[PDB]
């Protein structure tokens, strides 16, 4: 089956701000990737095996607003740039890749899936270079193999003149190690 | 909610149209030189390529454009007019084999539809089912490159 994706905005600026301070969010959850945000920036969190992972450079050491109040992180790894909260009731989790494919597909914040060729444990090259802005807000998002299993989480683009040509990602192995 | 694939009809028959690069592409053997309906009257074809069996009008109302493939994968996925997805293995520029043959009726009215790669991007436009005794075992398609060239 071909990887297709769609986004949906669940709340806005003011509603976000209040929920940030309140720490209580009653909205219904759906999806494998949650578009997430702080008062500072927006990024993505990917649910894999029951844990909603995201990038530490975005989530920091913050709690996640849930229907029962703020939820403390389950995992935190400043060096590997990871944080994980228990996946929200309602989200769907992806599962790690078990086919060692090198043909990866990055899902962006705008629900666009782009192909990237694996060029190392934590790097892949965009078969079609795009300006960095296209990737803006996509950290924490998934890098799927052809079968839709999680290969890694997008960490940072590798751009030059403002054009992203490659991407650095957190291989799903660092996740298993962060939980260890 | 916008759709990339339009289900279209003529007095004669029904088939599909796929929006790519702001153009609503379909099979010439389906639409001919026919103009497309619009709330403001019939809008004429932006491209007509009989040789390629390809025509295209400006993308209609309530549609979004599909991105062309750039990974060169041979694992295609044909989408039928009933929204079914059929895995096809690319055997060449304009041909691919259904990983599981289907009765000719299964693919009926899907000409014009897209052949997606693993990323959901357009590899080509379904042109014709290649059948053997009522069982379509493979398909003919128009590479997006042709669309890209026609423009």
């Amino acid at each position: 089956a071909p990887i297709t994706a769609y986004a949906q905005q669940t709340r806005g600026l003011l509603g976000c701000i209040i929920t940030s301070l309140t720490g209580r969010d009653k909205n219904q959850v759906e999806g494998e990737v949650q578009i997430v945000s702080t008062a500072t920036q927006t990024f993505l969190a990917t649910c894999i095996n029951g844990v909603c992972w995201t990038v530490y450079h975005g989530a920091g050491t913050r709690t996640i607003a849930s229907p029962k109040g703020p939820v403390i992180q389950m995992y935190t790894n400043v060096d590997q740039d990871l944080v994980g909260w228990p996946a929200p009731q309602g989200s769907r989790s992806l599962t790690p890749c078990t086919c060692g494919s090198s043909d990866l597909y990055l899902v962006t914040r705008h629900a666009d899936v782009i192909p990237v060729r694996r060029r190392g444990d934590s790097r892949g090259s965009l078969l079609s270079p795009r300006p960095i802005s296209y990737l803006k807000g996509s950290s924490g998002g998934p890098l799927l193999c052809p079968a839709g299993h999680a290969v890694g989480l997008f960490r940072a683009a590798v751009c030059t003149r403002g054009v992203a040509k490659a991407v650095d990602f957190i291989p799903v192995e660092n996740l298993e190690t962060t939980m260890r | 909610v916008e759709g990339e694939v339009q289900i279209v009809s003529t007095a004669t028959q029904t088939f599909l149209a796929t929006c790519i690069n702001g153009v609503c592409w379909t099979v010439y053997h389906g639409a001919g030189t026919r103009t497309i309906a619009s709330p403001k009257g019939p809008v004429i074809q932006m491209y007509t390529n009989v040789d390629q069996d390809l025509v295209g009008w400006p993308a209609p109302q309530g549609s979004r454009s599909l991105t062309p493939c750039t990974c060169g994968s041979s694992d295609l996925y044909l989408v039928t007019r009933h929204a079914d997805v059929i895995p096809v293995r690319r055997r060449g520029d304009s041909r691919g084999s259904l990983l599981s043959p289907r009765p000719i009726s299964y693919l009926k009215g899907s000409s014009g539809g897209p052949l997606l790669c693993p990323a959901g991007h357009a590899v080509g436009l379904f042109r014709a089912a290649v059948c053997t005794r009522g069982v379509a075992k493979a398909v003919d398609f128009i590479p997006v490159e042709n669309l890209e060239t026609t423009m």
Partner: peptide
């Protein structure tokens, strides 16, 4: 200080569909 909040979602599990009329 200040919780991370979900402001949207991205669904990967949806399959091609004919858009209903309503």
């Amino acid at each position: 200080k200040g919780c991370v909040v979900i402001v949207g979602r991205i669904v990967l599990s949806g399959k091609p569909a004919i858009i209903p009329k309503k």
